[PDB]
CSV table of C-alpha atoms and ligand atoms in Angstrom, one decimal:
chain,number,residue,atom,x,y,z
A,1,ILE,CA,-20.9,11.7,-3.4
A,2,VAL,CA,-23.7,12.8,-4.3
A,3,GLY,CA,-24.9,16.8,-3.9
A,4,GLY,CA,-21.3,16.9,-2.7
A,5,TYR,CA,-18.4,19.5,-4.8
A,6,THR,CA,-15.3,18.8,-6.0
A,7,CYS,CA,-12.5,18.4,-3.8
A,8,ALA,CA,-9.0,20.5,-3.9
A,9,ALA,CA,-6.6,18.2,-5.9
A,10,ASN,CA,-4.9,16.4,-2.8
A,11,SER,CA,-6.4,17.7,-0.6
A,12,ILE,CA,-7.4,14.0,1.4
A,13,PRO,CA,-5.0,12.6,1.6
A,14,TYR,CA,-5.4,9.9,3.7
A,15,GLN,CA,-8.6,9.5,0.6
A,16,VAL,CA,-7.6,5.9,-1.4
A,17,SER,CA,-8.8,3.9,-3.3
A,18,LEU,CA,-9.2,0.1,-3.9
A,19,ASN,CA,-8.5,-0.7,-7.5
A,20,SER,CA,-9.8,-4.6,-8.9
A,21,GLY,CA,-9.6,-3.9,-12.5
A,22,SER,CA,-11.3,-0.7,-11.9
A,23,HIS,CA,-12.3,1.6,-8.8
A,24,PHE,CA,-14.1,-0.7,-7.4
A,25,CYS,CA,-14.3,1.2,-2.9
A,26,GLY,CA,-12.9,4.3,-1.0
A,27,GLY,CA,-10.4,3.7,1.9
A,28,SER,CA,-8.7,4.9,5.3
A,29,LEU,CA,-4.6,5.7,5.2
A,30,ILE,CA,-4.8,5.1,9.0
A,31,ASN,CA,-0.5,3.8,9.1
A,32,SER,CA,1.8,3.6,6.9
A,33,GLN,CA,1.3,0.6,6.4
A,34,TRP,CA,-2.9,0.1,7.0
A,35,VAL,CA,-6.0,0.8,5.1
A,36,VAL,CA,-9.3,0.9,6.8
A,37,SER,CA,-12.6,0.0,5.4
A,38,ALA,CA,-15.8,-1.5,4.8
A,39,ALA,CA,-16.2,-5.4,5.1
A,40,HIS,CA,-19.1,-5.4,2.5
A,41,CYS,CA,-16.2,-3.6,0.3
A,42,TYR,CA,-14.4,-7.2,0.5
A,43,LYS,CA,-12.7,-8.7,-2.6
A,44,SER,CA,-9.4,-11.8,-2.5
A,45,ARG,CA,-6.7,-9.4,-4.3
A,46,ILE,CA,-7.0,-5.3,-3.9
A,47,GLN,CA,-4.7,-3.0,-5.4
A,48,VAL,CA,-4.4,0.7,-3.4
A,49,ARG,CA,-3.6,3.4,-5.2
A,50,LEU,CA,-3.4,5.8,-2.8
A,51,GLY,CA,-1.9,9.8,-3.8
A,52,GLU,CA,-5.1,9.9,-6.4
A,53,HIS,CA,-7.4,13.1,-7.8
A,54,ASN,CA,-8.5,11.6,-11.5
A,55,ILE,CA,-8.2,8.1,-10.8
A,56,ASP,CA,-8.1,7.9,-14.7
A,57,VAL,CA,-5.2,9.8,-15.4
A,58,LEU,CA,-1.2,9.4,-14.4
A,59,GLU,CA,-0.7,13.1,-13.3
A,60,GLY,CA,2.7,11.4,-11.0
A,61,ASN,CA,1.9,11.5,-6.9
A,62,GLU,CA,0.3,8.3,-7.2
A,63,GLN,CA,0.9,5.0,-5.5
A,64,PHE,CA,0.2,1.8,-7.0
A,65,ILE,CA,0.8,-0.4,-4.0
A,66,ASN,CA,-0.7,-4.1,-3.4
A,67,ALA,CA,-2.5,-5.5,-1.3
A,68,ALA,CA,-0.3,-8.1,1.5
A,69,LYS,CA,-3.0,-8.8,3.6
A,70,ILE,CA,-7.0,-8.2,4.1
A,71,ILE,CA,-8.5,-8.8,7.6
A,72,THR,CA,-12.2,-8.3,7.5
A,73,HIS,CA,-13.2,-8.3,10.9
A,74,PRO,CA,-14.5,-11.6,12.8
A,75,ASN,CA,-18.5,-10.5,14.0
A,76,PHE,CA,-18.7,-8.4,10.5
A,77,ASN,CA,-22.6,-10.0,10.1
A,78,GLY,CA,-23.2,-9.5,5.4
A,79,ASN,CA,-26.8,-9.3,6.6
A,80,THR,CA,-28.0,-5.9,9.4
A,81,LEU,CA,-23.7,-4.5,8.4
A,82,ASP,CA,-23.2,-4.4,11.7
A,83,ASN,CA,-18.7,-4.3,12.4
A,84,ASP,CA,-19.2,-3.4,8.9
A,85,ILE,CA,-14.9,-2.9,9.4
A,86,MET,CA,-11.5,-4.7,7.2
A,87,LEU,CA,-8.0,-3.5,7.2
A,88,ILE,CA,-5.7,-4.0,4.2
A,89,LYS,CA,-1.8,-4.3,4.9
A,90,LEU,CA,0.3,-3.0,2.2
A,91,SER,CA,2.8,-5.6,0.1
A,92,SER,CA,5.1,-2.6,0.9
A,93,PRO,CA,4.3,1.0,3.2
A,94,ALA,CA,2.9,4.0,1.7
A,95,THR,CA,5.0,6.6,1.6
A,96,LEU,CA,4.0,9.3,3.1
A,97,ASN,CA,4.5,13.5,1.9
A,98,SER,CA,1.5,16.5,1.8
A,99,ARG,CA,-0.1,14.5,-0.4
A,100,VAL,CA,-0.3,10.9,1.1
A,101,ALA,CA,-0.6,11.5,4.9
A,102,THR,CA,-2.2,9.6,7.4
A,103,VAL,CA,-5.8,10.3,9.8
A,104,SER,CA,-5.6,10.2,13.1
A,105,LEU,CA,-8.4,7.6,15.0
A,106,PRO,CA,-10.6,7.9,17.2
A,107,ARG,CA,-10.2,9.8,20.8
A,108,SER,CA,-13.6,9.5,21.0
A,109,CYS,CA,-16.8,9.1,19.7
A,110,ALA,CA,-18.4,12.1,18.3
A,111,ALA,CA,-21.0,14.9,18.8
A,112,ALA,CA,-24.4,14.7,17.7
A,113,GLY,CA,-23.8,18.3,15.4
A,114,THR,CA,-20.2,17.6,14.8
A,115,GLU,CA,-18.7,18.7,11.4
A,116,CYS,CA,-17.8,15.7,9.2
A,117,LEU,CA,-16.7,15.5,5.9
A,118,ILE,CA,-17.0,11.9,3.7
A,119,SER,CA,-15.8,12.1,0.2
A,120,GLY,CA,-15.2,9.9,-2.5
A,121,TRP,CA,-15.5,8.2,-6.4
A,122,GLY,CA,-18.8,7.1,-6.1
A,123,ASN,CA,-21.9,8.0,-7.9
A,124,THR,CA,-22.6,11.1,-7.9
A,125,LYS,CA,-26.6,10.9,-9.0
A,126,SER,CA,-29.7,11.2,-7.3
A,127,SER,CA,-31.0,9.2,-10.4
A,128,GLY,CA,-28.8,7.4,-12.8
A,129,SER,CA,-25.6,6.9,-13.1
A,130,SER,CA,-22.4,9.1,-13.3
A,131,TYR,CA,-19.2,7.7,-11.9
A,132,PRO,CA,-17.0,11.1,-11.5
A,133,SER,CA,-12.7,11.2,-12.2
A,134,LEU,CA,-11.9,13.7,-9.7
A,135,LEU,CA,-12.8,13.0,-6.0
A,136,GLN,CA,-16.0,14.4,-4.2
A,137,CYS,CA,-16.4,16.2,-0.9
A,138,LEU,CA,-19.0,16.8,1.3
A,139,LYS,CA,-19.6,18.5,4.1
A,140,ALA,CA,-22.3,16.9,6.9
A,141,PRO,CA,-23.3,16.5,10.3
A,142,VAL,CA,-23.7,13.4,12.3
A,143,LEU,CA,-27.0,13.3,12.9
A,144,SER,CA,-29.1,13.2,16.6
A,145,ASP,CA,-29.3,9.2,17.8
A,146,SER,CA,-33.2,10.7,16.7
A,147,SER,CA,-33.0,11.3,14.1
A,148,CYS,CA,-30.8,8.0,12.5
A,149,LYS,CA,-32.9,5.3,14.7
A,150,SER,CA,-36.1,6.4,13.8
A,151,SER,CA,-34.9,6.6,9.8
A,152,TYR,CA,-34.0,2.7,10.7
A,153,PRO,CA,-36.8,1.4,13.1
A,154,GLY,CA,-34.3,-1.8,14.3
A,155,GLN,CA,-32.2,-1.6,12.9
A,156,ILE,CA,-29.3,1.3,14.1
A,157,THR,CA,-26.7,-1.0,15.8
A,158,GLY,CA,-24.5,0.6,18.8
A,159,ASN,CA,-21.7,-0.5,15.9
A,160,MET,CA,-23.4,2.2,13.4
A,161,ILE,CA,-24.0,6.5,13.4
A,162,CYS,CA,-25.3,8.6,11.0
A,163,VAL,CA,-24.5,11.6,9.2
A,164,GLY,CA,-26.1,13.9,6.5
A,165,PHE,CA,-29.2,15.4,6.4
A,166,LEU,CA,-33.0,13.9,6.8
A,167,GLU,CA,-34.0,16.1,3.6
A,168,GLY,CA,-32.8,14.0,0.2
A,169,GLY,CA,-29.6,15.2,-2.1
A,170,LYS,CA,-26.9,14.9,-0.3
A,171,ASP,CA,-24.8,11.5,0.4
A,172,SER,CA,-22.5,9.1,-0.1
A,173,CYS,CA,-23.9,6.2,-2.4
A,174,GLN,CA,-22.4,3.7,-4.0
A,175,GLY,CA,-18.6,3.3,-4.8
A,176,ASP,CA,-17.4,5.5,-1.6
A,177,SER,CA,-18.3,2.1,-0.1
A,178,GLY,CA,-15.3,2.0,2.7
A,179,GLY,CA,-14.6,5.7,2.4
A,180,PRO,CA,-13.3,7.9,5.0
A,181,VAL,CA,-16.2,10.3,7.3
A,182,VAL,CA,-12.8,12.4,9.1
A,183,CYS,CA,-14.6,14.2,12.2
A,184,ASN,CA,-11.9,17.3,13.7
A,185,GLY,CA,-9.7,15.4,12.1
A,186,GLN,CA,-10.2,11.8,13.9
A,187,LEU,CA,-11.7,9.8,11.5
A,188,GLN,CA,-15.3,8.5,13.0
A,189,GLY,CA,-17.1,6.9,10.0
A,190,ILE,CA,-16.5,4.2,7.6
A,191,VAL,CA,-19.5,4.8,5.0
A,192,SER,CA,-21.0,1.5,5.2
A,193,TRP,CA,-25.0,1.0,4.1
A,194,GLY,CA,-28.0,3.1,3.8
A,195,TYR,CA,-31.2,2.6,1.2
A,196,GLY,CA,-30.6,3.7,-2.0
A,197,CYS,CA,-28.3,7.2,-1.6
A,198,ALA,CA,-29.7,11.2,-1.0
A,199,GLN,CA,-33.6,9.8,-0.5
A,200,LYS,CA,-35.8,11.8,2.1
A,201,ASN,CA,-35.0,10.8,5.8
A,202,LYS,CA,-32.5,8.1,4.6
A,203,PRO,CA,-29.0,9.2,6.0
A,204,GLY,CA,-26.2,7.3,5.4
A,205,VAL,CA,-25.5,5.4,8.0
A,206,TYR,CA,-21.1,4.8,9.4
A,207,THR,CA,-19.2,2.5,10.8
A,208,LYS,CA,-18.5,4.2,13.3
A,209,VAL,CA,-14.6,4.1,14.5
A,210,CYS,CA,-14.7,5.8,17.7
A,211,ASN,CA,-15.5,1.0,19.3
A,212,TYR,CA,-13.1,-0.1,16.5
A,213,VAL,CA,-9.8,1.5,17.5
A,214,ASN,CA,-8.5,-1.5,19.4
A,215,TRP,CA,-9.3,-4.2,16.9
A,216,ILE,CA,-7.4,-2.2,14.4
A,217,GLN,CA,-4.4,-1.3,17.0
A,218,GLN,CA,-4.5,-5.0,18.0
A,219,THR,CA,-4.6,-5.8,14.4
A,220,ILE,CA,-1.8,-3.7,12.5
A,221,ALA,CA,0.3,-5.1,16.4
A,222,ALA,CA,0.4,-8.7,15.0
A,223,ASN,CA,0.7,-8.6,11.3
B,1,LIG,N1,-25.8,6.6,1.6
B,1,LIG,C1,-25.5,5.7,1.9
B,1,LIG,N2,-26.0,4.1,0.8
B,1,LIG,N3,-24.4,5.4,1.8
B,1,LIG,C2,-23.8,3.7,1.6
B,1,LIG,C3,-23.1,3.2,0.2
B,1,LIG,C4,-23.2,2.2,-0.8
B,1,LIG,O1,-22.9,1.0,0.7
B,2,LIG,O1,-28.9,12.9,19.9
B,2,LIG,B1,-30.3,13.1,20.0
B,2,LIG,O2,-31.0,14.6,20.8
B,2,LIG,O3,-31.5,12.1,19.9
B,3,LIG,CA1,-4.7,9.2,-11.4
B,4,LIG,MG1,-4.3,7.7,-20.8
B,5,LIG,MG1,-15.6,6.5,-15.5
B,6,LIG,NA1,-39.4,6.7,8.5
């Protein structure tokens, strides 16, 4: 997260870190047994780390649970990044408490201008590289359809939204991929793609979760 602030510890209790040896992606706990992330995060083996604040220190509230199943959306396209969504079934249920909690799926899509919260352990620098120990947070609004599609001509499908700023400086970045965009209590976005991070007129593009509630629920019921 570039241009954000450090979240209060465990204040994003649905945020997870996906670990393959090191943190590589975010995700969101939506069911006791299921995390949703981005398809471009796929790895064949993933440990899900719940309850984290400092991903470099064991602070006690963590739950480390290996993935049992990893299911990318059948229509993910790695070029266009359409359908950039993946589900991870936990090998045992997460234990839900104040620091580990589910986040609701969307009841509707979000209006333009809706305020959201984006979080992750990704790169914090707009030039160079710094990967934080502590979870970072950013407040950002859902952008207008004209602001989003003008920024990426021909590239915004109906399964994508832009959230962020057209001025440079405030965005998600590498290592935030797969993490949440929560607006009014609902997971509306998954950190997906853009052009670099926090550059002017290149806001973050996010998987539009309100189009995927049926796919999510059907995958959970079947597995
Ligand atoms: N603004 C961004 N480029 N965010 C997405 C992080 C890399 O997929
Ligand atoms: O969201 B508008 O006005 O494109
Ligand atoms: Ca920790
Ligand atoms: Mg140590
Ligand atoms: Mg480090
Ligand atoms: Na432009």
